[PDB]
Design a protein around this nucleic acid. Sequence first.
DNA 1: CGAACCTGGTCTTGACTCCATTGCCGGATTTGTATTAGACTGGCAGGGTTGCCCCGAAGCGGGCG
Length: 50
Amino acid sequence: HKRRLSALGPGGLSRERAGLEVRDVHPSHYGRMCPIETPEGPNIGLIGSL
DNA sequence: CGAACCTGGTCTTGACTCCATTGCCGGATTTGTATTAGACTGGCAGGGTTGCCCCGAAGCGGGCG
């Protein structure tokens, strides 16, 4: 629950404002953010981990 | 077969107690209203990034009495 990257919050995009393109894995994530671990609900890609 | 009983209540009567229920009556408190004389004179201030769809509004190029 620490080391968690969360792209939603005040100043950040909400889930209804969330497009499909922010939730993908850009190839700059390699070594900076894990492509595997993300919550499988309606938050897939908005919440990650370092 | 009758006498006398004592006991199931049935009901009343009177005397006494207690207790609510207004009734003043005065003080406490509670709520409303008014009044303060130097001068003072035009707001903060924030967010906001989806996408698609339907429709209505404003405008610009096109011709015309």
